[PDB]
Amino acid sequence: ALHFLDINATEVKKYPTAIQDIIINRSFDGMIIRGVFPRDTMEQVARCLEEGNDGGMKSILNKNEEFGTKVAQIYGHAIVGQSPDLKDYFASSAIFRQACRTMFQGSPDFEEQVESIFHSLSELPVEIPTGPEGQTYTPATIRLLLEGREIAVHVGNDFLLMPAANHLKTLLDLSDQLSYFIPLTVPEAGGELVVYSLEWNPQEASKYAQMQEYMDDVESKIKSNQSQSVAYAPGPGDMLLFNGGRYYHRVSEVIGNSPRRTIGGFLAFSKQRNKIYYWS
Amino acid sequence: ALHFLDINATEVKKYPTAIQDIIINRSFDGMIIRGVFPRDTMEQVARCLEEGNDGGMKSILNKNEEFGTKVAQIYGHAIVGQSPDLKDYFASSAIFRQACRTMFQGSPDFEEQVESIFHSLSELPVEIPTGPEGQTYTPATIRLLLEGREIAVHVGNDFLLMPAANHLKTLLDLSDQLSYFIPLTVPEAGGELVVYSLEWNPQEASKYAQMQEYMDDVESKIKSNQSQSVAYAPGPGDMLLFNGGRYYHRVSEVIGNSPRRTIGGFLAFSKQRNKIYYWS
Amino acid sequence: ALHFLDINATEVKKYPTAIQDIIINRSFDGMIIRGVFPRDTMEQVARCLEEGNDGGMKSILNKNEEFGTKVAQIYGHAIVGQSPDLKDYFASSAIFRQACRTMFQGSPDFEEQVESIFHSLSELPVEIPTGPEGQTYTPATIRLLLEGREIAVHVGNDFLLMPAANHLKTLLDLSDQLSYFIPLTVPEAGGELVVYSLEWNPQEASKYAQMQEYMDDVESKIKSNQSQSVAYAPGPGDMLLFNGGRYYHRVSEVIGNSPRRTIGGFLAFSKQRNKIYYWS
Amino acid sequence: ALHFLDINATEVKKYPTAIQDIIINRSFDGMIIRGVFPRDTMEQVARCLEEGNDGGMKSILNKNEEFGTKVAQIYGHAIVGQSPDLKDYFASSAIFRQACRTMFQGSPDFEEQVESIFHSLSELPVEIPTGPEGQTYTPATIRLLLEGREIAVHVGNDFLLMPAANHLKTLLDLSDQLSYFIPLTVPEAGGELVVYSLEWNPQEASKYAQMQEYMDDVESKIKSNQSQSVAYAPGPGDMLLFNGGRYYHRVSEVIGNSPRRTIGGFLAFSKQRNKIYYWS
Numbered sequence A, B, C, D: 001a002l003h004f005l006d007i008n009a010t011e012v013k014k015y016p017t018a019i020q021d022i023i024i025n026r027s028f029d030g031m032i033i034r035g036v037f038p039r040d041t042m043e044q045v046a047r048c049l050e051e052g053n054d055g056g057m058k059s060i061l062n063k064n065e066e067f068g069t070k071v072a073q074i075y076g077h078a079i080v081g082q083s084p085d086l087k088d089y090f091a092s093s094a095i096f097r098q099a100c101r102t103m104f105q106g107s108p109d110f111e112e113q114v115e116s117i118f119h120s121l122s123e124l125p126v127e128i129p130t131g132p133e134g135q136t137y138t139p140a141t142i143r144l145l146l147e148g149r150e151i152a153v154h155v156g157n158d159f160l161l162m163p164a165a166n167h168l169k170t171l172l173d174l175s176d177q178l179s180y181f182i183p184l185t186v187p188e189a190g191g192e193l194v195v196y197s198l199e200w201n202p203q204e205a206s207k208y209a210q211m212q213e214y215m216d217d218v219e220s221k222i223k224s225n226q227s228q229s230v231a232y233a234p235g236p237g238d239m240l241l242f243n244g245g246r247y248y249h250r251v252s253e254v255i256g257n258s259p260r261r262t263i264g265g266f267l268a269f270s271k272q273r274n275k276i277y278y279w280s
């Protein structure tokens, strides 16, 4: 995958076509924007969580008990895997927006930082979606991978077929959706983003029990031997931004004591490609 | 290879046994210390070079058109591969030290920063080697990889068999030597450190033309269907520290316009293992 | 010339107006400061050179066989007669500053010593010029006159019309510049500083091919019966400091085996006469 | 005059024939031995005088004029121009020896230093003459030139025709006598030794009233135009040693406030050239 930019956050202005290029033109596949947040910012935010001085965010922590101890714990309600009503999603999302502003102590505030990055890369306005009759979506979600845990293979564009999506399908240009995330703490080893070469293909994916078996099965029947995969491990405060709507991806198993705290969501164009919408 | 720590530079204090461990105990193979330098420092240093406002360092740049256009250009003379006199090495090394101190505007000074990091990791004293007749070795070297170029496969401990080494072998405990480097600028793609599992020794290394096709053997050497490799790409200000004395390694071909500027050298114990020596 | 003080370096404090006096008021013409350096220091420094234990200085020795065996060899690059770039000047100056500190083993360090003398004589601060893009100028230069050789007539203030001067002219008050030098070894005979009574006169000097013929030609057309000259021969560690910017001068042919080794440079005021600048 | 050595006191050992050479072979004319005494010693000795903490030497100071303000004040009796009895000479000579040993505080003792120097230069024993009836001669004499004063022209070898000499003529090999002196303090300008090229010539000297009009008168009658003279100015602790017995010589008029304090005497071979005698 030509998932390549590894850009200094500073020179982000040099790519005012970058989002349009990944989604629509598909000329490249993702970016690594280095230093979107100060490593200091990330360590104090990551410390708030670890103790409890967190603007009230322990109160939306959804350790995912009965999915086994092999998928990620997660602060705030992730819109993926929600009842199509969105009762509790719109609810936790307000808590998240507030508890987050607190923790970042405006040095620099999470939401505005991310917005200017997305702004500079698209040159369109950036908004978090307003719900049907005024609720707020959440701009992002903090994922917690404890040692041993991992996030399994999945694709962005399956969300377009999910009933919870039904509101946003009315707001969004139904292009590819992008993923983005910024690490608060990194693990000692592993726990790296792995993007597969293979594109969005629901028809053939569904015929497998667990979707990793689809990735494996492909990697046998394709035996050229380039590699089908490419893996990154962005450090604290480095943003990773990519066409996760299109490409199958995952996170490696976390090695060693220290967990992988990591905040982010998704990102896409809107109906008539005017605003840039970013949610989770 | 358990080339694994990915530590935040801040908590470098928690590992005061770390260097002895990589070299002497071989209990693990390397570290990535995140944020040894402020991203801000790294880009202004990189701007100084790129412009010319460089404390006079342009006068020791060695573009190596002597070797075809696939090896790195390099500021200051790297001690590896010099006539045993070290005349032109000791000279350029004096220029390096001043121009380098200059460029960092003591915010924070290169020699001082790196020294405290190596200190915290050993709790031994850290010194730059003084030459036979009072000269100075250079503490490091700025390597410049232009688009298309690369660094070929090699091992640190071959230096121990080299003529230019003859001085230091009197100064060093002849254990493993470590490599270390800090990226000033990162490329768009590629140009990543790849460390191979294959260890240092003198025998069948001698039997070739030379050495990337020692990563001939390397792969149909092994396999079950292992990894002979591990690959890293540290961002601006992130230090990479590893037992490159022991394991064969290289740097990927740099892809894309912007070049891979990178400052660093090597690192080892001293005759009766008290102070820690670091040079380039 | 009232080139007269022959002061014991000790009582140098008694003349805190001295530099302002020679340069600006021109109330007297120069000093001989006896014992700025220990005779022990001068013999051990000169022995480091003579052998090779020189902190790496042999590598900036510029024998000038390109000019006939009529002018002096010289360690380090003298700023006079340089391309206006100062690329190789600034480079050697870095080397010089290092090898010099080394050789003096801080007993007492060259730069520190010299600075305190210049300090006491002006009561202004003393600095070595930092260059346009962060380089260092050389605080001094070691001159080597072998037996038979000599230094030809010249004036300090021509440097003001030289293109290599273009940087410092922005830094200096464009007063007269003074010379200073301290003998490491003295020759058996000859090799003495000869300062002529004649003042700086570029227009009329330029009409001569060899500038000595200007000194001769004047000394015929003037014949009163005083003397036009005054000549000195300071022993090891004796500093000679005088207005060589204003007056024509030279060094006699060296007689006898032992060469005339001598370290020194020039000395001047700064733009708005605060700081004292000294270089070579 | 080949009055040339300007040797470092250290390497005085390299010339074990030098005294025999100046006196007997007349192969050269004199030496300047740099650093016989520490500048530190010289100024603390000079401070003792200037104050009064002088081991009692004020009691042999002969402010001298009886003779017009033409010649120098002088501590102790100089043997030249004495009653042939030597009663008052031998008496002041005892005083001088004690106050002098005193003032030097054995750091290094005057007699002992000078003796080792004369020793290294002859490889003969060195002694101060014991008088006829057990008295001592003085090893040296401290001369004091105040501002404006000077020493008139003279030759060493007239002393041989003087009645005050009659004793030593039984002691000395009647070769040439050398003069020697070491400055304790130097004046601001002038007050330098001038040795003329002209040799010892009593018959023709005696015909002039003032011995300078013999020097002027000669320098007119064979007007070629090299120079007939040579002039020296040794700093504190530098010894000047030369065949002043043979050549007419003098001291410049002292310029400026600070006087020219200076200790020294003469030096010659002994009857059957074994021992080296030195007195004043």
Ligand SMILES: O=C(O)CCC(=O)C(=O)O
Binding pocket: A143, A151, A179, A180, A181, A244, A249, A250, A251, A262, A263, A264, A265
């Ligand atoms: O590592 C994360 O925070 C999530 C990775 C992922 O699957 C995504 O890009 O949404």
Ligand SMILES: O=C(O)CCC(=O)C(=O)O
Binding pocket: B143, B151, B179, B180, B181, B244, B250, B251, B262, B263, B264
């Ligand atoms: O990245 C660099 O600066 C050179 C890499 C290398 O060969 C080393 O670390 O020893």
Ligand SMILES: O=C(O)CCC(=O)C(=O)O
Binding pocket: C143, C151, C179, C180, C181, C193, C244, C249, C250, C251, C262, C263, C264, C265
């Ligand atoms: O003797 C020297 O070192 C140089 C003399 C000279 O020309 C100067 O005073 O600058």
Ligand SMILES: O=C(O)CCC(=O)C(=O)O
Binding pocket: D143, D151, D179, D180, D181, D244, D249, D250, D251, D262, D263, D264, D265
């Ligand atoms: O400076 C002196 O001590 C006197 C010089 C002199 O005439 C002598 O050497 O005897």
Ligand SMILES: [Fe+3]
Binding pocket: A156, A179, A244
């Ligand atoms: Fe995802």
Ligand SMILES: [Fe+3]
Binding pocket: B154, B155, B156, B179, B244
């Ligand atoms: Fe290497």
Ligand SMILES: [Fe+3]
Binding pocket: C154, C156, C179, C244
């Ligand atoms: Fe000069």
Ligand SMILES: [Fe+3]
Binding pocket: D154, D156, D179, D244
């Ligand atoms: Fe005399």
